[PDB]
Amino acid sequence: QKLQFVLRFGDFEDVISLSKLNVNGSKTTLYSFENRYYLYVDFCNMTDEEVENQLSILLEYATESSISIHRLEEYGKLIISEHALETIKKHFAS
Template structure:
């Protein structure tokens, strides 16, 4: 796989169909199977992170172009606007993709955020994050704090706890403040809610922190 760092927020990589099949993926299946396209994407992103130290933080804009012998993928992290008031994602209007590439673009851009980039408003935003915790005691400590405007769901997978956080009706500034507090106790994870729902064990739904505080504090 070939990787090119474009700038601080954007990375481009190319994977041939032969490489894709060597990794155990069917080149036809990835166009329409959400789980397979998600698995392939995060496998590639792990390599990108190792080589370029490109971390995945917040919403992503993912562009996929099908070439004759492989896929070209461009990933851009959302960034704050110049006035610091909202998150911005690039939305290219002049790109032409095949039907298959359009389908894969749609699947991948649903991984972290069901909302489309052009639906992000100036004052309020809806964002989802997944944090991981190696120790349950860290979750107990986190639950002692007050949070509003978000739903929290707790999963376990491979001896690790994952907290899915769904922020609703909060300004970007409020999301940043609350997320910074979450990150004092947990760390960012590349796991998606789809993977957790399929392979993880649901421990507490929607009001996880409230439930933990009620029973363990």
């Protein structure tokens, strides 16, 4: 089962919101593309049950884009690497 996903938020504030929680053993990176912001999640080693779980939360705040992840790595716009959630929580939660 796959352990890396790419999600699209409609408006940026949706991302801040997500940030205000716990990323947890979750490397994550954030792109800007077609004016909408995509976010790329990478779970290292988790039980499938544990991931289908976690991913649930994420999509309270996003949807999952059919977007080829390498389209971003090439033709996107990087904004924050590896610790993408973590950084937004810094500059935005209060």
